Amino acid sequence: SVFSMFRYSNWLDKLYMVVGTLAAIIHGAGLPLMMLVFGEMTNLEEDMTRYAYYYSGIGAGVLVAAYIQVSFWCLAAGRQIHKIRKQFFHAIMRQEIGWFDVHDVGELNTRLTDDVSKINEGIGDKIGMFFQSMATFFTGFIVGFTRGWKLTLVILAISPVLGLSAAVWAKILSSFTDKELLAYAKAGAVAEEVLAAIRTVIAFGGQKKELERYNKNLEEAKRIGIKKAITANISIGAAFLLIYASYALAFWYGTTLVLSGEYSIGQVLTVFFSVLIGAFSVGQASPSIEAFANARGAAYEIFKIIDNKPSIDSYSKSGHKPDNIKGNLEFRNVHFSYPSRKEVKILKGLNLKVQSGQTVALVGNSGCGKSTTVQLMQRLYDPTEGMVSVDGQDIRTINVRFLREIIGVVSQEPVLFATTIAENIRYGRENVTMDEIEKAVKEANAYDFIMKLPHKFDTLVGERGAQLSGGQKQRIAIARALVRNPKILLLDEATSALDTESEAVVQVALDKARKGRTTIVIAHRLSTVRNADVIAGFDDGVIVEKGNHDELMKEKGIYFKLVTMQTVSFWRIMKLNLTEWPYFVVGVFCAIINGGLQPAFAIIFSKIIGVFTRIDDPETKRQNSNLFSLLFLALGIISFITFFLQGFTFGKAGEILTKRLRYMVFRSMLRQDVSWFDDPKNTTGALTTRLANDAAQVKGAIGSRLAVITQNIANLGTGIIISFIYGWQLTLLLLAIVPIIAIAGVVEMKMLSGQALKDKKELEGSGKIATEAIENFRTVVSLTQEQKFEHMYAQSLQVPYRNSLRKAHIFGITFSFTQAMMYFSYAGCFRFGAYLVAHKLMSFEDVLLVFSAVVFGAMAVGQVSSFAPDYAKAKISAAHIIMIIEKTPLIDSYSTEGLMPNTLEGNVTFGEVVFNYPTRPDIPVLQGLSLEVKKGQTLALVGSSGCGKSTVVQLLERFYDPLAGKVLLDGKEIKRLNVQWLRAHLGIVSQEPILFDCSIAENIAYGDNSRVVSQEEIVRAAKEANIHAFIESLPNKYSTKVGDKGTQLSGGQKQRIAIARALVRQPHILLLDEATSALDTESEKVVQEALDKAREGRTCIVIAHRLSTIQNADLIVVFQNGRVKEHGTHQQLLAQKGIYFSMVSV
Ligand SMILES: [Mg+2]
Ligand SMILES: [Mg+2]
């Protein structure tokens, strides 16, 4: 699957790349020509000045070639970066729901960011650098062939071994990188899944277990990365060992020739200079081939997904969209099973039918397949066998886009995007008028509370619409469905958390327009289906009961059964590596040795020339040449050892540091309080992208790149030391030419710091958008807002794209100018040395040696410029990582200080509780209500929807500390009590709970952390929650893997599972927030009886909008305007004719 990375190369992109290749070739060819100059050098002041002028002229050519090469490659890389991101997100959004179910999804988020950053940020400039180095090696060989025939032939004959070794090591490195990126993606998926359910996790105190689960994937990634580092370092060390062995053999053959005299001393010296330059070119090349191998590895999975052509294309136009669409639908022999569990049969081939305006309600036992019916109708899943048809024409023939456009579906367990309410509604249809929105919301009985809040329609909802109460979220979803003005409404339990009055008004409003809308109302509050045209009774996947309400009651079947039952770190990050300092010590020592031995070739050449011209004894000359060759071979072996040691130690140090940074940042994010998760900046997608970006950037600036930079800086330092020692009044020239380099580097860093900060913020926003789309993928697919999300993602990426092009130009300027200035300095130093020699102030051999050292350093310095952008980005990435890790909220879950009472009676008292959500601090919700619950008393509260019911329990859970007031526990102020202790004792049933993607047994066991859960306990809890029977019923029993966020199991099933989870703790305090949100009255009665049997001894607070689950409540509290308007038992409240009587009667 090679070359796929260029699949999105535009003709302008191709021109960019080829021009860059030519420019890199030209730039590389220039350096060895300097060595060719020595060949001419090997009146003299005239030739010295001639060579100096030639070098000065070549300086501008090198300037232009470098700028062109770098800019073209970076521009192509940016274009590929943007095109690949766009097309990959397109492919992800194209996938049908089946592929979305079978495969893990949380991976895709971090896959995007990590893979793109590791693929294109690896191809772009590094490929150009590799072409430059290969061109330099080839040009060195060519000049050697010009000046010789034997030694150059030997070098060429030894080259293909190095070539084949590079190829094989690149292949293996890419293979390893595939698994490394898979491990990173698994870690990212775990992080995303945990963060989405942050409320539940902090409720059940599961931070440690999630942290360990993340650490597992982190450790796998660490191991794979260390393996890759070893592979790369071994490859490069072997290449250089072969290079030095070839050089030593060439030196021996030159000793053989000198006696023969076939080539002069100057000729062989020039050949050796060219070959040494070629070896250093290969040394510079190796990192680029490593990076390209990483790029291919990262491309593997991305293009695997891209080439995943689905069956239900959500973009093709191969269907019919007839103008006249009468809302008539019918199922026919619809055999269907979910691809998530192929075995289970859920639809036995039922057959329904409705006519335009006829409302066919679906009623039955929980999880009987109603949601499956609407899913199959929406063409999310193609039935195994069946002729599901609308207005005669089969659904399959019709075009999917138009079909879903004309269908409006309420999101059972509603899901709203992290935008403003206006836009949340606007997602219903593209072109929508504010008047239409007002009319729809009025129809939804939502205008009143919307106007109540400041920024009536400008108020923001959080992730998955968690900033609003369940009833408010349902009403907003109702508005979203209505605004589409659909011919086929798919109302799905839209009367779930609403207050009885709210449900009544919504039903009346829906009926007002039901005449022309083909609604399919699914509900369990049977009142909401009393006036339904047709009521469908589901059993075992088939419909038996039918007809209107009177006929259904006469049948005395399932429907009648239920009805009756109702009755800043440039040194801080380096500081953090205190536990690795042996690795840095060994690596820096080896890098210093390599740098010093780099220019040492000049001294070696000087000594060899002296030996060849010192004595007249051919035997002595042969002995000296043999000694020098042996020294070169030993130098090569030692260089192999040192290269591998330094490269490996720095690679392992980078990997370990990055893993520790990832673990620390994730743990810090878990530490942070829920309130911090409220801020729109901190959303799950943002956080996961933040991880995958910051950690990777810090790695990139602390990994083997730092190793190569230390090697190059040591090379430059030892070159300057050699120049100063052997020459004086010359190295001062280069030293005084450094200051422009210093200033240019400062300017480049200053610009790129801001550029990268802006790019990072934009990338965090884009990750937020992508994660919001993918996590709520079902809803967006149902609304066909995929195109809108793609546009949002492209618009968000727009800023990084322009910033990337700008960085391409900036870095091209910096690198090309630095190289050109270095070559001008070399030419000027040569001219000055010639002038001094004519002045009889320096021997020519010394000047030649110093020029050799300076040219070696000029070849070396090619890497610092390449490093500069990496350091620029990593500075800010680190800064943010340190900021996050150092953060500490008002309340710390890990904090073990405070009060930890041995035993709690379980009496909860609240007084003067005044609170407002920090998201909208101005708006008050609690009016200082006073409450008191004794041990073994199932207190309950009811009132108008979204009147702070969930807020009371959330304050009880210390999600937010009260703004003003005092809430105690057994006569002890909650604050004084250790947060973890209470969070363990208390139990929260949540609202529309999100179960994790694990084994159902594992999900239930999650309820009581810090102590293993015996299978007996889990099955007992399931039986108590009236699900153990079903749980055993399904294949694999408890091995079944609930989909991401519990999306696979039906609403009632996950409700019961959450009930069981909260039950496993057997808590002294049991807080239930609409535990019976979606349950058949029979199951509701069973669970209520189970709770009542255990009611005594376990103080309980239950909130629900169904009087049936609260009729026998110990004490019912009526909440109005945040205050306890009416409080009393069922008999007392019924005797009075206040709000409770009105709500019950309706
Ligand atoms: Mg359902
Ligand atoms: Mg609630």
Coordinates of N, CA and C in Angstrom, one line a residue, residues 930-934 937-943 949 952 1070-1074 1099-1119 1124 1126-1130 1133 1140:
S930 N -35.1 23.8 52.5 CA -34.8 23.0 53.6 C -35.3 21.6 53.5
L931 N -34.5 20.6 53.7 CA -34.9 19.2 53.6 C -34.3 18.4 54.7
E932 N -35.0 17.3 55.0 CA -34.5 16.4 56.0 C -35.0 15.0 55.7
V933 N -34.0 14.0 55.6 CA -34.3 12.6 55.4 C -33.7 11.8 56.5
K934 N -34.5 10.9 57.1 CA -34.0 10.1 58.2 C -33.6 8.7 57.7
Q937 N -35.9 5.9 55.3 CA -37.1 6.7 54.8 C -36.9 7.1 53.4
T938 N -37.8 6.6 52.5 CA -37.6 6.8 51.1 C -38.3 8.1 50.7
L939 N -37.6 9.2 51.1 CA -38.0 10.5 50.7 C -38.1 10.7 49.2
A940 N -38.9 11.6 48.7 CA -39.0 11.8 47.3 C -39.4 13.2 47.0
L941 N -39.1 13.7 45.8 CA -39.4 15.1 45.4 C -40.0 15.1 44.0
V942 N -41.0 16.0 43.8 CA -41.6 16.1 42.5 C -41.9 17.6 42.3
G943 N -42.1 17.9 41.0 CA -42.4 19.3 40.6 C -42.3 19.5 39.1
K949 N -34.5 19.5 40.4 CA -34.5 18.2 41.1 C -33.2 17.5 41.0
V952 N -30.4 19.1 43.3 CA -30.3 18.7 44.7 C -29.4 17.5 44.9
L1070 N -29.2 6.1 49.0 CA -29.5 5.7 47.7 C -30.2 6.8 47.0
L1071 N -29.5 7.5 46.1 CA -30.1 8.6 45.3 C -30.4 8.1 43.9
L1072 N -31.7 8.1 43.6 CA -32.2 7.7 42.3 C -32.8 8.9 41.6
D1073 N -32.4 9.1 40.4 CA -32.8 10.3 39.6 C -33.6 9.7 38.4
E1074 N -34.9 9.6 38.5 CA -35.7 9.0 37.5 C -35.2 7.6 37.1
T1099 N -31.5 4.6 53.7 CA -32.1 5.9 53.4 C -32.0 6.1 51.9
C1100 N -33.2 6.6 51.4 CA -33.3 6.7 49.9 C -34.0 8.0 49.6
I1101 N -33.5 8.7 48.5 CA -34.1 9.8 47.9 C -34.4 9.5 46.4
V1102 N -35.6 9.5 46.0 CA -36.0 9.1 44.7 C -36.7 10.3 44.0
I1103 N -36.3 10.6 42.8 CA -36.9 11.6 42.0 C -37.5 11.0 40.7
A1104 N -38.7 11.3 40.4 CA -39.4 10.7 39.3 C -40.6 11.5 39.0
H1105 N -41.0 11.5 37.7 CA -42.2 12.2 37.2 C -43.4 11.3 37.1
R1106 N -43.3 10.1 37.6 CA -44.5 9.1 37.6 C -44.9 8.9 39.0
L1107 N -46.2 9.2 39.3 CA -46.7 9.1 40.7 C -46.7 7.6 41.1
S1108 N -46.8 6.7 40.2 CA -46.8 5.3 40.5 C -45.6 4.9 41.3
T1109 N -44.4 5.3 40.9 CA -43.2 5.0 41.6 C -43.0 5.7 42.9
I1110 N -43.9 6.7 43.2 CA -43.8 7.6 44.4 C -45.1 7.5 45.2
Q1111 N -46.1 6.7 44.9 CA -47.3 6.7 45.6 C -47.1 6.3 47.1
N1112 N -46.3 5.3 47.3 CA -45.9 4.8 48.6 C -44.7 5.5 49.2
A1113 N -44.3 6.7 48.7 CA -43.1 7.4 49.1 C -43.3 7.8 50.6
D1114 N -42.2 7.7 51.3 CA -42.2 8.1 52.7 C -42.6 9.5 52.9
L1115 N -42.1 10.5 52.1 CA -42.5 11.9 52.2 C -42.2 12.5 50.9
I1116 N -43.2 13.1 50.3 CA -43.1 13.8 49.0 C -43.0 15.2 49.2
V1117 N -42.0 15.9 48.5 CA -41.8 17.3 48.6 C -42.0 17.9 47.2
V1118 N -42.9 18.9 47.2 CA -43.3 19.6 46.0 C -42.3 20.8 45.8
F1119 N -41.6 20.8 44.7 CA -40.6 21.9 44.5 C -41.2 22.9 43.5
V1124 N -39.6 24.6 48.7 CA -40.5 23.5 49.0 C -41.9 24.1 49.2
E1126 N -45.0 22.6 48.7 CA -45.9 21.7 49.5 C -45.1 20.5 49.8
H1127 N -45.2 20.1 51.1 CA -44.5 18.9 51.5 C -45.4 18.0 52.4
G1128 N -45.4 16.7 52.2 CA -46.2 15.8 53.0 C -46.3 14.5 52.3
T1129 N -46.9 13.6 53.0 CA -47.1 12.2 52.6 C -48.2 12.2 51.5
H1130 N -48.3 11.0 50.9 CA -49.3 10.8 49.8 C -50.7 11.1 50.3
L1133 N -51.0 14.9 51.0 CA -51.0 15.7 49.7 C -52.3 15.5 49.0
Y1140 N -49.8 19.1 43.8 CA -49.7 17.6 43.7 C -51.0 17.0 43.2

